[PDB]
Amino acid sequence: QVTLRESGPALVKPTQTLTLTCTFSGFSLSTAGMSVGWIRQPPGKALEWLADIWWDDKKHYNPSLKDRLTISKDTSKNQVVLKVTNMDPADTATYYCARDMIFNFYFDVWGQGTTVTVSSASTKGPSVFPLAPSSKSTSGGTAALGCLVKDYFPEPVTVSWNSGALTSGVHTFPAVLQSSGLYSLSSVVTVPSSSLGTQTYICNVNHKPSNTKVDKRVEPKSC
Amino acid sequence: DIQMTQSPSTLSASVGDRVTITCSASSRVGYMHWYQQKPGKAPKLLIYDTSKLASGVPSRFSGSGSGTEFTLTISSLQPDDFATYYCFQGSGYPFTFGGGTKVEIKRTVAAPSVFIFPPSDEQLKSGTASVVCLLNNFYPREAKVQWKVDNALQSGNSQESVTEQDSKDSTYSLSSTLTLSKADYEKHKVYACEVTHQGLSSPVTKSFNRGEC
DSSP states (O other): OEEEEEEOOOOEEEOEEEEEEEEEESSSSSSTEEEEEEEOOTTTOEEEEEEEETOOOEEEEEETTTTGGEEEEEGTEEEEEEOOOOOOOOOOOOOOOOEETTTOSSSSSEEEOOOEEEESSOOOOOOEEEEEEOGGETTEEEEEEEEEEHHHBSSOEEEEEGGGOOOOTTEOOOEEEEEEOOOOEEEEEEEGGGGGGOOOOOOEEEEETTTTTEEEEOOOOOO | OEEEEEESEEEEEETTOEEEEEEEEEESSOOOOEEEETSSSSEEEEEETTEOOTTTOOOTEEEEEETTEEEESSSSSSSSGGEEEOOOOSSSSSOOOOOEEEEEEEOOOOOOOOEEOOOOOOHHHTTTTEEEEEEEEEEOOOHHHHHHHTTEEOOOOEEEEOOOOOOOTTTTTEEEEEEEEEEHHHHHHHHHHHHTTOOSSEEEEEEEEETOO
16 A cells, blocks of 8 residues: 655754655655655644655745755655754654645645654653552452553653553553653553453553663552 | 634534534635544545545545635534544645644543552652552543642642543543652652542542552
């Protein structure tokens, strides 16, 4: 199928340049009528179109950002690059590449997005702590357990349970920037208390910006 | 440049309700397109060329309009329609998106289940103590959580986080996290999370004594 995937650094310092790459397959950017475009989205704000490139190397830019943007293609590697110079806090966003065609002039297939944060602060891996089930994390016939994912920077972090095999009753909370300037979140799973022994519980945490990967067993505490 | 407004900014409606979202462009465009964005996902093409359904979209959704005024219609709103919807013009450069409309599902009142977790011994060795209070599967979103520590009401050391509305049952979940230093934590016995919500006739308290099983 037609697929696109964005890559680039999670973190850039103010005044530095950002380089993003979109790698695509299931189509070619030498094929007449084909375009790849870049779209961004600041945390909880509207989508904003940035740039596009066409099979014939025609380029277009959003006029407010034009002085800061350069789009380029390498047909030979199925890649499109966007360079954004002089990054500032307003450039913190999720960056999307998408496919457009001359028949459409709309983005029909999108990549999954890559998160970029513009900050002075250093990368930091999370500490991962279990939220052990007990009588106190029981309500009716429901038990709760979880993992506290504490003191990381920047976004994002991923959390799954039992390598993604356990999915129902899972609630992974959105990260909050703490007063210390580092992120924290919990991920919790609910199960009927008399159903707890059906499996063990492992939260797999991955912070790709610090190359950190932690597995944590969450068991009941003893005396 | 061709710019668009979207109305309303936020919409709450029941399952089965007819929903209408409008887009108004600064000058006439030949087509308007529509995207559906779930939280933590890429936007998905929903309607293209004003009226055409994109692949996999149920018949429930339809688009209409011309010139500057366009309409996205959901004839019978379903729990899985919780999203932000954007209009998009690609008729002329620069390409532009409307401000977005967030659609939430109105449901019957459901009381939170309340759960408390003391800090782990692993966190306590590393020098901090986080007390987590969990409110699970409730509606509406609005909820008050108060921490009491040895019968003192806490302020400015607790943070909340709330899930996006659940795509099957339309309920929310919330975490309230109380953070102290290990030193402050070990000074005190009774840790209590007190929860006020529409679905509970009186506040609910979960508490533990520090140091017990």
